[PDB]
Each structure stands twice: as structure tokens, then as C-alpha cells.
């Protein structure tokens, strides 16, 4: 036992790894330097990954997020900010993917993944792929084509994990 030690990930490419896991359980076990949040521009951590991370910090992430946004104003779609990882990680990189359910520009998903290249190693979810309504296969593709640093993707759903791995390791 040490820190940033990932286990049970499938190596997709030289720098992209994928596991069927809860990003919160992975954060707790690994204590990564950086865990990524699938955030909105307001850092209102209502559901999905954001709700699960915030709940595991006993709401400390939401209190910090409320203070940050009241001070700085909202993020841009495709942007990020580095805040505390609380009890889960050294840092949390809050990254805003486009909300395609509200017609936001899918091109901003590439801008969102570009934020990952500022960090050597990240534990991350598939951006925009849940509540934000992007195709998860497309989100994995943009991740693989954009991110050059080491990214460990945690995919909660068993069936989604199997679909992502089979489509990737065919195409
Ligand atoms: N605990 C978890 N660990 C790992 N992955 C997780 C976990 N919970 C959900 N996911 C997955 O992450 C992906 C991203 O889903 P969301 O967390 O909904 O992020 P997205 O970028 O789609 O939506 C962001 C919005 O979701 C709101 O919660 C947040 O405050 C913001 O407004 C989906 O494939 C989502 O899968 P699903 O569609 O919820 O089954
Ligand atoms: Mg699901």
C-alpha cells in the first residue's frame, strides 16, 4: 500500500486505462494526486459522479465549491478549476463537459479533456456521458484522441464497461 497505485485497470492505449468501478471507491483506495469531477459551470454537485464525490466528503466539496463560485463566478463550458481533494485525493480537478441534453456544443468535450494534459496522472470519469447526455463511446474516443497524460477511467455501470471495451478493442 502507497499512493497513485491503480489496480485492475485494462490498458486501452499507452496512456489510457479503464476499470468497471465507482470513482469514489477508487479514490478512497488509491488516494490519487488528482481525481476529476464531471462538473457543471456552477459546481453544483447534484447527482452522478459530482453527487457521489461530494457525499463522500460529507458535503465539504459543496461548501468549498459554493465559496469558490461566489468569489470567482461560474466556469466556462470546457473549462476546469483545481480545488481540494478533501478526504479522497490531494486535488479535485472540476471539469465541465458540454451538456448535450441542453444543446451545448459537443466540440467543447475536446476542450474539457484538454484540461487533463496539465496533470501527469488522473483518476477520471467519462465526461458528459451521463446526465449531460453525450454518447459514452464518443466521450471515450475524444478522451483517447485528446489526453496524452496517464488517465485511469472509472466506469460505474458493468454493461457500459463491457460495451466500451468490446467496441474499443474491435475499432
Ligand atoms: N460513482 C461513479 N463512478 C464512476 N462513474 C460514474 C459514477 N456515477 C456515474 N458514473 C458515470 O460517469 C459518467 C458521467 O456521468 P455524470 O456524473 O452524470 O456526468 P456528466 O458529465 O454526464 O454530467 C454532469 C452533471 O451531472 C451532475 O451530477 C453534475 O453536477 C453536472 O451537472 C456516466 O457514464 C455515468 O454513468 P451513468 O449514466 O450514471 O450510469
Ligand atoms: Mg447507469
Curated annotation (Swiss-Prot):
Q: Where in the cell is it found?
A: Host endoplasmic reticulum membrane
- Catalyzes what? Thiol-dependent hydrolysis of ester, thioester, amide, peptide and isopeptide bonds formed by the C-terminal Gly of ubiquitin (a 76-residue protein attached to proteins as an intracellular targeting signal)
How the protein is activated or inhibited is described as: Inhibited in vitro by GRL-0617.
What domain of life?
Viruses
Instruction: Give the recorded effect for residue 166 to L.
Output: In strain: Gamma/P.1
The shown chain, on whole-protein numbering, covers: 1025 to 1193 of 7096
Entry function: Responsible for the cleavages located at the N-terminus of the replicase polyprotein. Participates together with nsp4 in the assembly of virally-induced cytoplasmic double-membrane vesicles necessary for viral replication. Antagonizes innate immune induction of type I interferon by blocking the phosphorylation, dimerization and subsequent nuclear translocation of host IRF3. Also prevents host NF-kappa-B signaling. In addition, PL-PRO possesses a deubiquitinating/deISGylating activity and processes both 'Lys-48'- and 'Lys-63'-linked polyubiquitin chains from cellular substrates.
Tell me, how does this one assemble? May form homohexamers. Interacts with N protein.
The molecule here is called Papain-like protease nsp3
Topology term for the membrane: Multi-pass membrane protein
Q: Which gene encodes it?
A: rep
Q: Where is the Macro domain?
A: 3-171
Amino acid at each position: 500500500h502507497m499512493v497513485n497505485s491503480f489496480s485492475g485497470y485494462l490498458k486501452l492505449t499507452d496512456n489510457v486505462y479503464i476499470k468497471n468501478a465507482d470513482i469514489v471507491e477508487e479514490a478512497k483506495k488509491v488516494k490519487p494526486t488528482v481525481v476529476v469531477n464531471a462538473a457543471n459551470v456552477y459546481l453544483k454537485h447534484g447527482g452522478g459522479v459530482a453527487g457521489a464525490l461530494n457525499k463522500a466528503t460529507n458535503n465539504a466539496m459543496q461548501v468549498e465549491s459554493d465559496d469558490y463560485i461566489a468569489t470567482n463566478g461560474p466556469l466556462k463550458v470546457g473549462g476546469s478549476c483545481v480545488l481540494s481533494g478533501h478526504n479522497l485525493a490531494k486535488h479535485c480537478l472540476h471539469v465541465v463537459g458540454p451538456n448535450v441534453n441542453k444543446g451545448e456544443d459537443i466540440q467543447l468535450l475536446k476542450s474539457a479533456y484538454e484540461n487533463f494534459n496539465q496533470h501527469e496522472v488522473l483518476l477520471a470519469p467519462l465526461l458528459s456521458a451521463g446526465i449531460f447526455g453525450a454518447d459514452p463511446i464518443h466521450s471515450l474516443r475524444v478522451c483517447v484522441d485528446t489526453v496524452r497524460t496517464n488517465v485511469y477511467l472509472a466506469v460505474f455501470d458493468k454493461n457500459l464497461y463491457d460495451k466500451l471495451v468490446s467496441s474499443f478493442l474491435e475499432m
